[PDB]
Amino acid sequence: VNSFSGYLKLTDNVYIKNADIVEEAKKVKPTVVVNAANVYLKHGGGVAGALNKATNNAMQVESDDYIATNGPLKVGGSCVLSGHNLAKHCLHVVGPNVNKGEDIQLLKSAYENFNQHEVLLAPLLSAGIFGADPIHSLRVCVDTVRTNVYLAVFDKNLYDKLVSSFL
């Protein structure tokens, strides 16, 4: 048993809820929250800007030191950093950004990072401002992630679109 509440069960291991990922992290304090990161860990908008804002910019300060030491992530890659006040850890995962022209086939590689963690609170990757189709992102998630994933999909309209169409 875990602390996640109000989720619809899609599969053996994938759950979904109409909830903002920041408010969910603050309530649950999960072991792992996933950030929808870019390769530079520049948290400006979407999930990254909201999580960083909720950490009072401590996520960005930590991320800038990570990049200064290690250089940029790969598209499809990840790193584990602090979860600050939101979670034990933040798994920063880079899905392909369609609005920058990246290979959508890299979305499966992105989701494979989740399999290194037994339980995660996560957005969809590559949807919203990243330019891909969220229905596709949910299908790749279900067909790639084997660990237990709780998908916090921001508002009613995106929640309603994903559930009704789910195969």
Ligand SMILES: CC(C)OCCn1c(=S)[nH]c(=O)c2[nH]ccc21
């Ligand atoms: C940044 C990209 C991946 O956004 C996807 C949509 N998204 C989702 S799925 N859950 C949230 O909680 C959330 N907050 C802001 C955006 C957002």
